[PDB]
């Protein structure tokens, strides 16, 4: 139904603004709010249907410390969205603390703009992994909305900032962060900023302005994920039915994301299918194993051998599901919007659950244990010391999170029809 | 062929037979199965036909 | 005084009631037209006082 | 048929000269007092059939040390009426006994004008609660309305000038004005300064000229409740027809008011209904609950349809009436009216029997009781003291409220097949 995006930290608000700026462009919507002649589609999932005859989009931004906020204002598509949601350090437990003393106002904002729309769906975060002002800050106000609100659902869109290796401070932030968003997200979007960058400076000759680029490919992706929701499709036409089918357990609820086209600057969904089960693909990356996996294509196509494409791609025996679980590919097609012009229309992108992440779990958790073990990276802040003096909620959340990776493990095997 | 596409319609007319009757636009079966959840699940077999005719009225 | 008064008010209130609940269960055979009857009682209070059927 | 209007207090003197430029605007009269050629609906309501071939307005001023009467005078709109019946302190005790010392004259005024029509039908007042020079001296003559007239009804117009909080013997005067409102008038509309002034800062970038605007809204509510009776319509052309239906017992007369357009810089009446009903729309702001619901809508649309908003409405199932009463809302069509460019001519009103004012009543009253309790902000004037030595009036009033403040919550619940 209808969906309230709430943005903070400075990546998070900067992929929220080029995501608005996309849906601006995608849309028949001016830079000042107003329907145009070119619209109809449903444009009630994202923007309020306002009284000035204004699709006025559901965008809450809150900042701590803001700089690049500054940026976004003085610009049209900061008078695109403006409901009065907008508000005005670098550690997770300074960040949680001065996200605990202005909780009451902004947590204000949320309900008034909770109480302001007709229906609610859910509520989905633009966030950044140990971002510095949004790590902590996130953690503390995603358990209040988790405690605030039972009924509504949580969505994570994260990032991990690192320019291919890093602060000595952001596995500890990275730990308690995922702590929180295992126990209380609903679903979370993880990318590696490493390996975008990475495929973003072979794909083309970006190297400095790589970041603004990361920010046109988040926003396809997020544009890409919800397209079904804002244009009239058949299935899943709310999140939760979209969120339900990649969820085996709810501690497996991290999804790995693809994207067929490496550039954009006519083939059949056979091509596209047997390309993004690749790793060539995959933007984001014993032998670790999907648990399930759900794609979405978009493009000018002609949709019947769709059924000739599953049938020659399950006799080419590439890929195998799961030993307890008679798992499955799971398929929607949908259309590339209009109002932004794209050589080579079919875009394919995968929403999938594997266990792949598990190790990148590891690799944090490895790092986080040397830094643990040699105990002069930890930097040694006082709001750090004044938060928890016994750092106990760092061996909650490496409990917690060695447990996931051997529930990551024994999902991989024939160990869940037993305990693991 | 063309006195059946002027003066009523055939083609457009069939969509929408395709849309509802077959579920072939299931956004309307989503929303009319979310809105009218507790009418269906609590028994309707004893509730005048009009009733679930009006309901559906505003439903489409 | 108020022997008079009451006693009017009494007995005309509970006429009332029961000629005016008679009117509304007598056009709820009637059907579509059911439009009046429970318009004149908006679902919810005075559904009723006097239970019908 | 014919009914006089008495303006009284400096608020009420501007708000009716509004009303008076508003009507001089609306129907075909000049800013002199003749009838134009775009005169013919009814014009015997409110303007006396002169015999200069001119419509002369019956507007009867009345006032207390007056100030702001005089930049009404010099004005194209104190010409406008002239019929001879215009007329040149802060507390309730004050303006009471400075009323009582004048009585004569300004009764022989009203005297004069009322046998000056050839029918009468009504009494209509505007005042301002607590208002200082109006406080008071409304009160007393209000009383000395309904001694020497019992066959003629009182209406009376009043606004609760409050920039959102106060004065320290305004809940003073509000409970002994309260106190006349109740056992000597027939109809109230009372409306909150505060709820209005937010709608109109939020609606607009009015802040500082807020009061002239809302002269404009009080102005258009008066026009609109008189429309039907002005204009050629079907039901209610007397005040006591329009004024029975909303009253279920002479102590529940206090009316809400609504209004829908929220600014007025083509729909149903489905759309407006489906609105009116929702306090995003009240200006006038347990679950307090209505007793009866009138609703006037005034716009060029399609009627056909009345019948099936009513069946849409009705199962919708948002609303519902008293236990005790088989009650309805009851509902008026008119016409807007030429002579005036308005951009979305759809415009509704709703007048409501509502017990939620008993609640804004319980507020005075809790006010007036603390300030009862400190003695120490009733300022002591020695008008006030020889008034009343013992100050019992304000007992009786406040018995008087308290009995009212029961009969309200007692017509809320099914305790009116009882007595409370």
New interface residues.
Partial sequence: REIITLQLGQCGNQIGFEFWKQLCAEHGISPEGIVEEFATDRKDVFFYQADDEHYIPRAVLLDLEPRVIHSILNSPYAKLYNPENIYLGNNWASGFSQGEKIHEDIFDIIDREADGSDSLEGFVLCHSIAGGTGSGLGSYLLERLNDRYPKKLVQTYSVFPNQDEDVVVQPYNSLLTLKRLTQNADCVVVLDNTALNRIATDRLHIQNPSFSQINQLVSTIMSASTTTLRYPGYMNNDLIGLIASLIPTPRLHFLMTGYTPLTTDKTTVLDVMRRLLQPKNVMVSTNHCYIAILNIIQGEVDPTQVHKSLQRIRERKLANFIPWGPASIQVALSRKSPYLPSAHRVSGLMMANHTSISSLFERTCRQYDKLRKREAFLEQFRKEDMFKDNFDEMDTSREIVQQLIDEYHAATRPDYISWG | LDVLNKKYSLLDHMQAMRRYLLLGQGDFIRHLMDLLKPELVRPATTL?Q??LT?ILETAV | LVSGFEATINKFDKNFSAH?LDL?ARLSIY??M??VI?????????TE?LERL
Same sequence: chains 1, 4.
């Fill in positions: 005048y009009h009733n009006g | 005016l509304l059907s579509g059911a439009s429970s318009r004149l009682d908006f679902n919810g209070f005075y006082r």
